[PDB]
Design a protein around this ligand. Sequence first.
Ligand code: HEM
Length: 212
Amino acid sequence: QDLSEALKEATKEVHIRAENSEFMRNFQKGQVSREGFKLVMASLYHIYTALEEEIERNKQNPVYAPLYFPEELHRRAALEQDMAFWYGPHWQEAIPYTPATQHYVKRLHEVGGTHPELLVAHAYTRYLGDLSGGQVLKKIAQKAMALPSSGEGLAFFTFPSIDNPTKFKQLYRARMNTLEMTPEVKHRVTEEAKTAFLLNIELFEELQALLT
Ligand code: HEM
């Protein structure tokens, strides 16, 4: 069984749970506000910054190298533009760094620095979602908050270096399936992917509480 398929099957359950968190449920209904949107995007800024810092650290490591697509996938630059859009010229000192976000970042660094063979679980969880359902969330946000089709404020959800997300996704999956795999690695990667989903749900639960 290919890793790409093992991951999808192993996280399809927790994915349903994540979609139904209070925050994401409200979001889907289009009840997402500027204050709430800012909290999640600021948090993603920190998360992707940590994720990509670890990706760079392990770019030449075989347990991750085949998935090294900075130009097409990396989000930090886009999130920096979004931060300037939502928080202003001095966003760096204005954006929040919540406990749940810190917790996520902590695990990302543990994985990247100590268990790099599991980094793929975290890139899969975030990037493949962005390339698929993330496009749906993008439309919802635009409609809800009157964001321009030109893209301002939603750079995170825009991949200008990729013609077709569905095509790249298939490529990314194929490359994921070239990683040297053993029962040991496959089992732990799928487990870490479930943990990654949980970290996201915990972030969403925290943000909703901060909002209510
Ligand atoms: C309520 C918000 C969400 C919606 C509406 C949503 C919806 C979707 C949709 C429509 C797909 C494509 C289904 C398919 O190809 O069969 C997808 C895939 C995916 N989503 Fe989400 N999603 C949401 C939340 C999340 C969250 C919170 C994560 C974890 C950070 C996530 C990660 C993924 C991943 C990793 C995939 C790719 C699965 C695969 O093809 O292997 N999604 N999502």
